[PDB]
Design a protein around this nucleic acid. Structure first.
Ligand SMILES: Nc1ncnc2c1ncn2[C@@H]1O[C@H](COP(=O)(O)OP(=O)(O)O)[C@@H](O)[C@H]1O
Ligand SMILES: Nc1ncnc2c1ncn2[C@@H]1O[C@H](COP(=O)(O)OP(=O)(O)O)[C@@H](O)[C@H]1O
Ligand SMILES: Nc1ncnc2c1ncn2[C@@H]1O[C@H](COP(=O)(O)OP(=O)(O)O)[C@@H](O)[C@H]1O
Ligand code: BEF
Ligand code: BEF
Ligand code: BEF
Ligand SMILES: [Mg+2]
Ligand SMILES: [Mg+2]
Ligand SMILES: [Mg+2]
Ligand SMILES: [Zn+2]
Ligand SMILES: [Zn+2]
Ligand SMILES: [Zn+2]
Ligand SMILES: [Zn+2]
Lengths: 369, 337, 371, 374, 366
DNA sequence: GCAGACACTACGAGTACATA
DNA sequence: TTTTTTTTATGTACTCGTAGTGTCTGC
């Protein structure tokens, strides 16, 4: 246990500390799960947060004298101490036994630690495949499918989302047994099809790490684990083991009925109609007639809601009852202007797609008709 | 027997099962039937050590690998064990449900997964039924190991699922030699202890190691005092204990030997106590002995089965009913026809 | 490697079409007639003993209901829906181990999700096995759905004890009872399986396995796997007889002769000899009960006695000649109650000793020596 | 008939008007009089056993309350309201499945919307199915609602066991009780069903089905559907008898006679015949026990025998007047002990044979001979 | 609709003056004297069995306390405050369905109005109905309010089980316990109610209706309305007798009475009726066994009657006196054997019939 | 941006009760 | 006058404190 003298600046830490904060504090299930891992090595500071199944470390350059080592420092206390200091104020840290003395000007704080050995880590491994995808593209991949993930469903498959590759295309699939969200985007590199399943929480930290910067997100796909790299930030997590439902088997086989309209108008109309929907089911009935759309909603309070939309439709009239929360989420994800829908039958799955390009697609399974 | 002692009378069966497991011709759910202390725990431990890590030479331990390091330290996460909470006495269905879902969530390390129930007879009905689908269709390379002292007590819907293995008790002479080597006691005491434990050398070793021998000799002295006077109530002082079912079984064994002596059976079970069996034969009629034996067996079963039952009240009632039976002119009970 | 894990016969030989059933013809005829016509129901409850086929029958019913060939009495394995139902991963067939999830919360979530339309399947089949373990709250939750379910929903329930289920649930479903398989059907299925697996067998071993299966085919397959593991890759009469501890000599006959003669010394000497060789006690009591049944029958009809026990016919004839029927009935009753009492007083040896002493008690054991 | 959709008889033939309801004359007359005269109470509780009509009658009352022709005792099938009720899509017939919505929060939600008036209806009906399922807080949340409900809200509760409801709820709501249906009513209803639906049938099979589902009509309908499945789309005596596992009364009494008159060979022959037929042995014991009990009952009074056993009625009498009741007690005890100890016999056939042999040995009149040597 | 207008007998005829409450004389007299002398406790907690007027008497108290003519035992109907009490829309009467507003949030919100003066009444009166179910923290808030109550606020708690209430609230509340109404009072008020309405009635039918209800007036009135509906507008003896036979539940007592008198036809009819009224046969036989046990015990000491048999005492005393102990012991043994033997018998109705026949066979009745 | 506020919803824990 | 005293397994509600999540308001 050598002395640990940090001499750092706020502007170089507050963003890395925020990034490494993540799913820390909150629910402490056991003490040695710990708060942080601070490591001084080769003029770099590695700050590690964990969740007993996840890990992420931020690297901060040490342009000043340092002492290598590894120890812990409380998450909320350190974060708030660093945040509350004057803008640009320096931080000087010393270690005495198991005590951290943090000094800023004339301000002194004492902090308790735990041995670095007691901290739980993840066993190293040999990476299987690796991607270097641009940040904006990865954000587009995640946002198009994040909402559709299941909420603690018994079918563990639905609790995450799948990333797969075919040559130059990367496909992302999410589902919960009622919704399907698939999005395929170009890569620029060709790698074999090694599907991976990432749990919901891990996807949340993947979203948090992304900052829309020029640095491409690197990812190492393993067998039962995942690693990510954004600049100086490293991340790793476990994986859900199994197989996702075949999306091609879920997508409609005979999308004969076609519809096209404006995303904004449909989203606003569905939001208006969902007010009177059943708060426990959120089911709305859709009647498609010649160049006309009709949405009808009812709730146990016996209130009725009707909305009519101008649309282009060349098929036959059809009735179909489906959830309004799902279509609202789909339209929220779909940020373009014009949206197309493919329908087959009154109890057939409905495909939602961008009119500008195929890009990503969605599937909604109707309610009881 | 403190913990997991290898037993020579286990060596044959062991290798046989390995021959089944190594060739990929072993049932996923194997139900071990063995006496208490027969060593089924050691057999299951050795099997799990073979299964759960990198393949060894093909026999013995698994060598010096990550599997052995995690297993010996009890840290391997692919080695699920079902043991009743020490505060409780039975396998809560919540524990089995958690184990089954964790097993459904795929292995963590390389290799197969092993689930071991420390005792099948302690499974409650809900806990027993929570294992039916998992036994019927294990997820992938999942091997179960259930230990029991009698398969009939277990549910019929579970005995169907599991391939049953039988750990036959060792021949009596060999077990006597082994125990005499292990424990320095006279031959008669050794034989009586072995026959008391139905030929289970591990159970006899456990009986000798603890204070059970002192309790048995105290019960013998109390019975010797009580039999001629007819004051059986004093036996309460020796019968009320946490090990009451075992002492009631000892009493039933003494009554069985008394009836044997009345019929003059060439074989007995309390060899080293001829005085007590002679006194019981002399002072008690065969019908009275049979009735007392039936009542004692019934009380032992009621104590062992119904959880939470009060020991003191039952034992006192049994002793008072026996006192009533010893008095002349009292109608004896008969088995429920 | 075709067997990554040991695909035990209880799992490999699961029926895939209606023609693989071992003879549950009474329910199969109803199922085939219902599927052939338009008469289809939304709640089937198959009940019976363990390892009789009701889960397999339910899975076959689901395969027939969802195959894209149509509603066929005989499902086609070529169908993609059948390909997925025979394995896992079918979006429609939702199999719930009721004992695993007895909480009313899971049942309520299931009944919330039942409203949605099926994915690419004619009927969303809910197969709830071991339904008798569900909590009473879940039972009552499963009332209003089973009575007026959506057209695209079919409920298949399986249980080993119909009584434990509330009468209300039984009142809404088609109750099928799967009779325990007879000896001949089990033997024929076992010989067919072993011939298909290229594993040698003997007729006597198969007959013993069928006899000990107690009417359950899963028991027969488990016993066959026991024999395979302990029979060096073949089903042999010696291996199964040794593992079952069955009696080939007249030990039971000599024991009952000594007992009816009220010779306690002989009875206990024979029981000690039986303990020496480790004969299974339950089998001994079963054989004694069977011999007493034969004694009663020959007392009623001597012709009936002519059976496999021909080499020992004279002994049973003498016992029937010398023993009143009432004593035989009392002996049978005592031995039967004793058999009920084996899984009591865990040391089963003294349990059989208790039973034999109770049987001996009826006749006088007086020291009075008379011929 | 013409409907290619083979709707389940338990669903297709749900009562439409008060004329289509069989039995339950008490509740039917009470509701007809309380709806023709007026004075509609604000809470009903239909208490009865399974499959007697605890819900369909509630739906009929709902139809009778808010009908276009006013409050009527004859629910029409012409106006929109009644058909919407039957289709289950009606706006005001809030069908509260109390099994699912059992928590107190859901009951509070239900009580919150009580005053918000009915839409396209004279009354709003809160048909709470299986009220005996609500939690204690849910039970007690609706007390002051039941005691002083709004003038437009009527509760209709339907429970199987009212004893589990708190006593104050039994006080507030009307307590209508539905008796279990009789065998003749069930047979008549099934004859109506299999005449309206073009399915050939035999009266003996209908009687067997009616008796096998005693007290509950939905049980009878399900058994009849399953018998149609078992048979070639027709309810025949052979199909029903084979399906139920029951043994025809004539042959069981033949076995009983062979036991009583100490004819061992006839007993064995009948046992062999039953074995060849595949009838479950425990079912044979059950039928013999039932016949012995019926003999005891007709000894109690000759009126105890209905037309159900009429085919062998004479034989029944010829067994009642020839043997004392003590012999029946002994026979019933022996066969019942045999049934109790059957599961542990070497075989079910062996157990049944041994039980019959014991009844033959121990029966008093002309018992089995004992060995000549003492 | 097209049926004129007919209210419910339970909600109607609710008393509006203290003289219209039938029975419970001690509570009414104590309240009258307390209001006369000006001795009013801070909190009045009513308790008793169902349907004995606890809520109605509490509502009468709330009407009286805010009457403009003054605090009196007989508030007028003249006062507009009294009229608003009638209509249920009174600003100074706060009716809280504590069975619905159990959470501490709503209770605290409604108890934070103690700081505000009454709008048009002398006392801000809280009528917290069904107080027994209430969250523990809501009990804490209520206790904190009652410990230091404003002089212009009086509490009127009502409940069915006072045991569930915490002792800290009981020790601060003047508790009034209401008796179950006597049969004669119930019959008298039933006669008066049926005469005030234009409904014909019969004396024996009225007595049957009064006896059927277990001392609760709401039960009596509910059965009265149900019988009127079933009785074709007339309370006739045969119709109500048949109705109560259909609603008859204490089958086991009649079974015991018929069995001990060796009436084979009567017991057969009774068991047929108990089969039609779908029940559990094991439960019926357990009830019969328990009743026989009680009859055997009562003969040893009358004090065995207790409180449960308050509505059953008359028949049980006769059964205990008229039957020798040996016969009761034999019947108990026969029924115990029958219950042990029941599950293995055929369908349990057959087994119960057989056990009853076994018990009947002992007497020499032919 | 925007983060705090504020709502809102969910989860654990302590308590009460039911059925077997 | 003073202490004396309990049967679990499994499940289902109910209610309050603490935290996690959305979102949007003048900040
Ligand atoms: N009717 C049958 N035909 C063929 N095999 C059967 C039959 N019944 C049972 N089996 C065998 O038993 C095994 C388990 O059958 P299963 O259908 O699960 O019985 P259960 O009704 O108790 O769930 C099957 O894998 C099959 O080998
Ligand atoms: N009294 C009856 N008359 C005619 N059919 C009946 C009667 N009772 C029950 N049924 C049959 O049972 C089906 C469902 O009855 P239901 O009224 O739901 O019983 P429950 O009282 O249990 O809800 C009906 O569709 C009808 O065919
Ligand atoms: N003492 C009584 N005098 C007159 N009617 C009564 C009495 N007690 C109960 N009732 C009748 O019962 C109906 C409901 O009474 P209520 O006082 O609400 O009972 P609870 O004590 O359960 O709240 C009243 O409308 C009234 O008809
Ligand atoms: F083993 Be089976 F499902 F009864
Ligand atoms: F099927 Be009923 F409502 F019990
Ligand atoms: F309104 Be009471 F308490 F039934
Ligand atoms: Mg199964
Ligand atoms: Mg219903
Ligand atoms: Mg009240
Ligand atoms: Zn190893
Ligand atoms: Zn097919
Ligand atoms: Zn109408
Ligand atoms: Zn006034």
């Amino acid at each position: 246990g050598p002395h640990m003298k940090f001499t750092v600046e706020r502007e170089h830490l507050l963003k890395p500390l925020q990034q490494v904060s993540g799913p820390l504090g909150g629910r402490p299930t056991l003490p040695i799960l710990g708060n942080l891992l601070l490591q001084v090595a080769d003029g770099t500071l590695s700050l590690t947060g964990t969740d007993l199944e996840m890990e992420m470390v931020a690297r901060v350059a040490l342009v000043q004298p340092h002492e290598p080592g590894a120890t812990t420092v409380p998450a909320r206390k350190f974060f708030d101490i660093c945040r509350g200091l004057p803008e640009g104020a320096e931080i000087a840290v010393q270690l005495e036994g198991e005590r951290m003395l943090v000094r800023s000007g004339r301000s002194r704080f004492s902090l308790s630690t735990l041995p670095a050995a007691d901290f739980p880590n993840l066993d190293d491994w040999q990476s299987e495949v690796e991607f270097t995808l641009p940040q904006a593209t990865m954000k587009r991949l995640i946002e198009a499918t994040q909402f559709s993930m299941a909420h603690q469903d018994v079918r563990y498959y639905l609790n995450g989302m799948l990333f797969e590759t075919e040559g130059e295309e990367l496909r992302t699939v999410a589902t919960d047994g009622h919704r399907l969200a698939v999005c395929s985007m170009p890569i620029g590199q060709s790698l074999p099809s090694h599907s991976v399943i990432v749990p919901r929480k891990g996807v949340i930290e993947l979203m948090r790490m992304l900052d829309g910067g020029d640095n491409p997100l690197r990812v190492q796909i393993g067998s039962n684990n995942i690693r990510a790299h954004v600049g100086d930030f490293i991340f790793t997590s476990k994986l859900v083991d199994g197989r996702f439902p075949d999306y091609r088997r879920v997508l409609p086989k005979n999308p004969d009925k076609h519809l096209e309209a404006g995303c904004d108008l449909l989203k606003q109309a569905f939001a208006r109609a969902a007010i009177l929907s059943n708060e426990k089911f959120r089911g709305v009935r859709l009647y498609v007639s010649e160049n006309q759309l009709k949405i009808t909603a009812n709730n146990p309070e016996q209130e009725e809601a009707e909305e009519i939309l101008d649309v282009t439709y060349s098929g036959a009239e059809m009735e179909i009852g489906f959830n309004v929360s799902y279509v609202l989420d789909v339209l929220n994800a779909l940020k373009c202007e014009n949206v197309r829908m493919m329908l087959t039958d009154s109890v057939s799955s409905v495909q939602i797609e961008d009119a500008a390009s195929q890009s990503a697609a969605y599937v909604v399974m109707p309610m009881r008709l | 027997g403190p913990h997991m002692r290898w037993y020579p009378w286990l060596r044959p069966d062991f290798e046989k099962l390995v021959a089944s497991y190594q060739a990929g011709r072993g049932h996923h759910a194997l139900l071990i039937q063995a006496l208490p202390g027969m060593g089924d725990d050691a057999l299951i431990y050795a099997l799990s050590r073979y299964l759960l890590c990198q393949q060894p030479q093909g026999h013995k331990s698994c060598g010096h690998c990550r599997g052995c390091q995690l297993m010996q330290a009890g840290t391997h996460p692919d080695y699920y064990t079902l043991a009743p909470e020490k505060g409780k006495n039975t396998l809560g269905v919540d524990a089995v449900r958690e184990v089954t879902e964790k097993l459904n969530e795929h292995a963590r390390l390389g290799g197969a997964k092993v689930v071991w129930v420390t005792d099948a007879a302690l499974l409650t009905d809900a806990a027993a039924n929570a294992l039916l689908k998992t036994l019927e269709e294990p997820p992938a390379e999942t091997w179960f190991f259930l230990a029991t002292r009698e398969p009939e007590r277990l549910l019929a819907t579970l005995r169907s699922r599991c391939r049953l293995h039988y750990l036959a008790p060792p021949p009596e002479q060999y077990a006597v030699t082994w125990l005499s080597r292990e424990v320095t006691m006279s031959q008669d005491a050794l034989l009586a202890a072995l026959r008391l434990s139905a030929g289970s050398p591990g159970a006899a070793l456990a009986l000798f190691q603890g204070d059970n021998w002192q309790a048995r000799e105290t019960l013998c002295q109390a019975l010797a005092y009580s039999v001629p006077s007819g004051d059986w109530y004093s036996l309460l002082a020796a019968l009320n204990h946490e090990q009451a079912p075992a002492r009631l079984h000892w009493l039933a064994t003494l009554l069985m030997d008394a009836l044997k002596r009345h019929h003059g059976a060439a074989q007995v079970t309390n060899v080293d106590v001829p005085g007590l069996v002679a006194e019981l034969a002399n002072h008690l009629s065969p019908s009275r002995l049979q009735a007392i034996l039936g009542d004692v067996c019934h009380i032992r079963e009621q104590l062992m089965s119904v959880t939470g039952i009060n020991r003191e009240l039952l034992i006192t009632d049994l002793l008072l009913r026996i006192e009533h039976y010893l008095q002349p002119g009292v109608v004896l009970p008969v088995p429920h026809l | 490697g075709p067997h990554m894990s040991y695909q035990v016969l209880a799992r490999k030989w699961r029926p895939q079409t209606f023609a693989d059933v071992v003879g549950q013809e009474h329910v199969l005829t109803a199922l085939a007639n219902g599927l052939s016509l338009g008469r289809i129901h939304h709640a089937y409850l198959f009940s019976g003993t363990r390892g009789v086929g009701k889960t397999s029958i339910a899975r076959l019913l689901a395969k027939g209901l969802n195959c894209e060939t149509g509603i066929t009495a005989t499902p086609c394995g070529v169908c993609d829906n059948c390909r997925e139902i025979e394995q896992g991963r079918f979006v429609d067939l939702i199999e719930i181990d009721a004992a695993s999830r007895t909480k009313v919360e899971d049942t309520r979530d299931l009944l919330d999700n039942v409203q949605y339309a099926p994915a690419r399947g004619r009927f969303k089949v809910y197969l709830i096995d071991e339904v008798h373990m569900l909590s009473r709250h879940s039972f009552n939750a499963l009332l209003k759905t089973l009575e007026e379910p959506p057209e695209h929903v079919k409920f298949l329930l399986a249980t080993t004890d119909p009584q434990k289920l509330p009468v209300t649930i039984l009142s809404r479903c088609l109750q099928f009872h799967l009779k325990a398989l007879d000896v001949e059907q089990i033997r024929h299925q076992l010989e067919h399986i072993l011939n298909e697996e290229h594993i040698a067998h003997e007729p006597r071993a198969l007959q013993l396995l069928a006899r000990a299966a107690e009417g359950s085919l899963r028991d027969a397959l488990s016993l066959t796997d026991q024999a395979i593991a302990s029979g060096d890759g073949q089903v042999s009469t010696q291996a199964v007889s040794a593992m079952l501890g069955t009696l080939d000599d007249d030990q039971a006959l000599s024991l009952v002769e000594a007992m009816v003669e009220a010779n306690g010394e002989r009875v206990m000497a024979l029981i000690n000899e039986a303990a020496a060789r480790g004969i299974e006690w339950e089998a001994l009591l079963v054989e004694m009960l069977g011999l007493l049944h034969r004694i009663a029958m020959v007392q009623l009809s001597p012709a009936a006695l002519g059976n496999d026990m021909a080499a020992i016919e004279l002994r049973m004839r003498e016992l029937a000649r010398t023993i009143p029927p009432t004593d035989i009935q009392l002996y049978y009753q005592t031995l039967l109650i004793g058999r009920k009492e084996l899984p009591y007083a865990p040391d089963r040896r003294m349990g059989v000793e208790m039973t034999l002493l109770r049987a001996l008690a009826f006749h006088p054991r007086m020291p009075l020596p008379e011929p």
